[PDB]
Amino acid sequence: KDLKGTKTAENLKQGFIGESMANRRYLYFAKRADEEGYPEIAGLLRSIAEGETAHAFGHLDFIRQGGLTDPATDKPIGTLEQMIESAIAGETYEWTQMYPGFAKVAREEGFPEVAEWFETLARAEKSHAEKFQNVLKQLKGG
Amino acid sequence: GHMKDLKGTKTAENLKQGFIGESMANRRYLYFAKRADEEGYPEIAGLLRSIAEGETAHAFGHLDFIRQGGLTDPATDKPIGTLEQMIESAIAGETYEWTQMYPGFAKVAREEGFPEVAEWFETLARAEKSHAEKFQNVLKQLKGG
Lengths: 142, 145
Ligand SMILES: [Cl-]
Ligand SMILES: [Cl-]
Ligand code: NI
Ligand code: NI
Ligand code: NI
Ligand code: NI
Ligand code: NI
Known about the structure:
The structure is a homodimer.
Chain A: H1 7-36, H2 39-65, H3 80-108, H4 112-141
The complex binds chloride ion (2 copies) and nickel (II) ion (5 copies).
The site of one nickel (II) ion has 4 residues of chain B, from helix 1 and helix 2.
Domain Ferritin-like diiron (chain A): 2-142
Pfam families (chain A): Rubrerythrin
Keywords (chain A): Metal-binding, Zinc
């Protein structure tokens, strides 16, 4: 039956957010175990991180198979072309609005190094958008 | 000025939202790459994978500023300065997931008529309980020597 508008739709989205964060967090923590000489702990973090990849991807499977949109962009992700279109939408939001706004707030709050980081990221997501736009032209053009 | 205190600022909130978006971007792009793989688009798959490495760098940089600025883990609101604190944050998130989040998700899925999704959430609840237990076992090592 149709997932659209249900609480289960929203729970799949929030599950995807948390699983995405868990993989990132655990791989960041593993770097600290690496440098301090705890290979067993780093290995466990990396193996559990693969678990959280499987969890995130399974959430996306139900989302996609249920006709729901991308948690990050609210765009469909059924076909490869739609996937690339979702990538373009998010990169475009990030470089045109999100990261420039974050940089302005950081400057105005007295954090110039954080602002410089956000400006580096804005330029980076702009490059991403351009590379994905070239892929979209290849796919849509055949 | 890497250690400037960020508590209470709008910048603190923006670092957290940045981390959330970068975390999702890496997962999304690796999931999309699998579709490119199946369909025979290795150049698209490779670009997705390389850009996904960029988003890993972005996410980790946000975590650097969060930690240096005196802020907590975006996922758990626990400090993540030391390795012990990092593992404690992992345990806290896993515990929330298996005691509350995924059981509740599973109950709602059953109530709305989505038994296959409910089964998946129940599998994940048991999985995060195992995660919490494996993490608790290594914390006992750090804290005992
Ligand atoms: Cl170890
Ligand atoms: Cl290709
Ligand atoms: Ni998980
Ligand atoms: Ni990007
Ligand atoms: Ni400094
Ligand atoms: Ni990024
Ligand atoms: Ni887990």
